[PDB]
Amino acid sequence: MVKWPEYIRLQRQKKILRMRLKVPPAIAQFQYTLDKNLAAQAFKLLNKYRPETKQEKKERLLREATAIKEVSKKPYTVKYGLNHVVGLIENKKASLVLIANDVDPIELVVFLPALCRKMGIPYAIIKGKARLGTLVHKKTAAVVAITEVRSEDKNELAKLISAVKEGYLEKVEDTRKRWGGGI
Amino acid sequence: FYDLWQNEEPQPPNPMHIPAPKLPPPGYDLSYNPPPEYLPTKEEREEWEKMDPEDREKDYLPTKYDSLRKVPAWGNFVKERFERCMDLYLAPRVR
Amino acid sequence: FKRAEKYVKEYREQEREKIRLARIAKQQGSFHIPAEAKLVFVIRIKGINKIPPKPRKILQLLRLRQINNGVFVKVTKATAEMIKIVEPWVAYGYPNLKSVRELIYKRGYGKVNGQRIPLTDNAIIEENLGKYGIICIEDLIHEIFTVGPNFKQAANFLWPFKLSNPNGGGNREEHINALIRAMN
């Protein structure tokens, strides 16, 4: 009958293969992603801590330079960059970690749930490497971490952390060590 | 805003350029208060309302009015302007 | 599938309506206004979804059912009761005479005998009622810009003007003139 293009067929066959093979339990744990409510409440806090864009960083530099021609505290932003975040994990400087579920060399993020478990930092596998990049003004972002928040919202971060260790990491507990797929 | 003609020279019109024929001037028919010779019969008005639009030689027939406050605004004013707009940009003109 | 959050937002937003309405009925049906009489133009404002019965009947009394339409109203003791009851769904303030001038000329529509037909002629204004000193368009403005002994009758002829939707844009002293300016 009709003929399908080559890259079209390969996209679908890889999706079938990655979900139906005997997947080892470090890739199978990436199939379990947090709920829609928890993701929305996570991005409610994280959008309040968005990094400054190139347009408004330049504006602030022009503000401070102008005042010199004619007093602040440490900036609290959202931490990104895989090499940066892993170091923040290893020094126990992070409080909540979000991991994209679609990193296409998946080896960049396989150790990352277990590394956060070893040091005790609450993590949550999230849908969208594109969604995290939007949060941090890039096309993509494999991992997103929060380290310290301002005093006006220490309570809702600790509430969000408790909603991860109760709503996400408790359900994952006896199903992150099991092989995925089958048949 | 800058002035236009810092350097102006006449340009000969090409024979291909066919300008739009201008609209006819407002004649004696278009007035609000025509002479009684121009006043039509009420039967002619009733027949004219009976026929469908775009089936008449004249889209308007006169009617005698007394005062300015009795004179109404035309219903198809924007329709006439839009039909003109389609006339000079969607209907070609034979030279 | 209505989410649970929407349910909780409703109840907290209905209890605040119950609290404020009790505070209005507690003190009095009066507003801190000087004794000089003025005129208020009120415009429907998109607001709280579920309407309690008492603000709902006041919209009905002010013929404010459909959104974004607006009517004229003077100040009485009784009017300030309706002003502060329906306040979260309306915008109010004293307009200007030229603001009325567009509202009768450019924004003017007609209401006679229970059916809503547009304004047709000055003699049609005579045909509508045309009697209580009503001879032209400025009759309505005279009853509006100046306080009218038959302004209640002038409102009786009047219909709520369906104002125009703007695109991307407490009593206002004269800032309501900016309201129609984007909404004309």
Add this chain to the structure above:
Amino acid sequence: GKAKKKGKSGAARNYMTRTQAVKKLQLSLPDFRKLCIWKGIYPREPRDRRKVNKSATASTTFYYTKDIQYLLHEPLLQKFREQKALEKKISRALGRGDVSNAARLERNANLPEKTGKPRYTLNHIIRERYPTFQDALRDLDDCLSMLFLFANLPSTTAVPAKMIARCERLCHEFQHYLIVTHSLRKSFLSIKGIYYQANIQGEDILWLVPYKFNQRIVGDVDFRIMGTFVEFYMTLLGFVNYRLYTSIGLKYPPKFDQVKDDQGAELAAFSLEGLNDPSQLFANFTFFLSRETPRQPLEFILRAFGCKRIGWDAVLGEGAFTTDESDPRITHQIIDRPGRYPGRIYVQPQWVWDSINDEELKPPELYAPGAQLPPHLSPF
């Protein structure tokens, strides 16, 4: 000793259809039409429509090749591509989510709904379109009469109220020039509205102003097309009245007061400072306009012929001569109704209209109110 093809050469080169024109221009079907009113490109007809294109119909429209070549060599085509991505970038910060970046892109958009100034620069387009200042007055026949119609019109999505408020500003600016230089000579009225005739530098200009009444736009009409001719005649009259205002030497733009205009002054809200037969008619006269009488045409006619003092009602407007009818300074009071001061003579607006047409002071006894009006004559 060689041959060619009949359909390939000749009349196919000189005239091409509208479908072939929009394909060569590589624009969308609507985007051709705004550009085609801008450069004044007209379809016309060849002598033989079958010879130009064998598969053709009389309903189809052809176009000039050099006019399309002129359309290809316009800077607006580059401005169309830059602006098209700009609305693509206004869906950028709206999509991913950035309120500040969506703002700073839309101040950079400079959209006409909040400015009144147009979206595109029409300076070079009118540079190539109209050749001389006399044709500006010839095009002022069409330029004024829609803007007096548009200023009375309400607002739609295509024409913002700020565009009309700039139309009402610009229509008032041409009126203030006319009442200073007294260039208005002839006036006619009919069912359509009020026609004014004024001569500027020997050029007669005719425009039609309908009455102060909301007009039904019922039917199939295009506001997107109509909003462009607003932008057309905004810039043209803005260019025309700029040239003539330095010609009379008064400082431009005229100064305006906001809130005193908001009180309903209409014509009388603005101050003019002269440094940065018409006059003899009502050279020393006193006028009052009553509640029924049309305030805008009567004041425009009186000030155009040098009437020094015109008063009217406090609900018709403000910032004028004293409203009180008991004040005996008034000579003639305009009344159209179905005190009785002997000092003031009681008349109609028709007496003004016929005494300004004949310029011979038509008798108020033959034009006394309560009596049948004698039939008037068209000045044309």
Add this chain to the structure above:
Amino acid sequence: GALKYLEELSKKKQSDVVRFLLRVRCWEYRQLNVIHRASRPSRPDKARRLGYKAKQGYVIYRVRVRRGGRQLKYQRSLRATAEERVGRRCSNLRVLNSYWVNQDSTYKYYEVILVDPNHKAIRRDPRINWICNPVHKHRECRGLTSTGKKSRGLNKGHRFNKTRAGRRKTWKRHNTLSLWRYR
């Protein structure tokens, strides 16, 4: 420090997660072309330590090479054949280095790093602009890459006496009869 975790993962490539990933990727690469372009390296730790940078001018190309004997044995390595086919395909680039990425029962799969010598991001960087010199045209054909230096035996010691300064240059020197003037 995510790349230290990747280095230990490539060490354990018989393990469950790496055998799974190498299986599902070798299947994907068989439907693809013989030589095709990769947007990002499959082993980003290996590419970066071999010289790859995320700059305009660096590209990654993946090639499958037939495996087995030529009992004639081809002295040219499979890696050197992988370099030579890509350089023929991209005659405008310079082959920098190559590394093993996968293998099968019939094919062996290599990813090669190439540098554009005409891109002026490359031309302005003193760490890479040595490759813009014309003595580095087609390094994979002269044996100037890491595979070539291994097969040419360019190592110090008494074991590599015949090949450390060039094998043919050593033979020509030892087989030359040198006659002086005052003999």
Add this chain to the structure above:
RNA sequence: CUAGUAACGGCGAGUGAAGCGGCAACAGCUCAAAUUUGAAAGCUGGCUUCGGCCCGCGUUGUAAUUUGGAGAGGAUGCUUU
């Protein structure tokens, strides 16, 4: 020069180095492995009144710091542009 030495050899044919030593010439460096994280600080193009504006690359990592006879970070005091 070692040296027709060691070594390998139908131990026949023969094949055949290197270290040391005297000279000629001399020159040392760049990454990956680190968190800039109190601020992607980096770069390609386009428009340019040539002054500085936009797009894009890039956090799956572009600058600066470091390259194991090292180095980093503090502290301290001299010395260099």
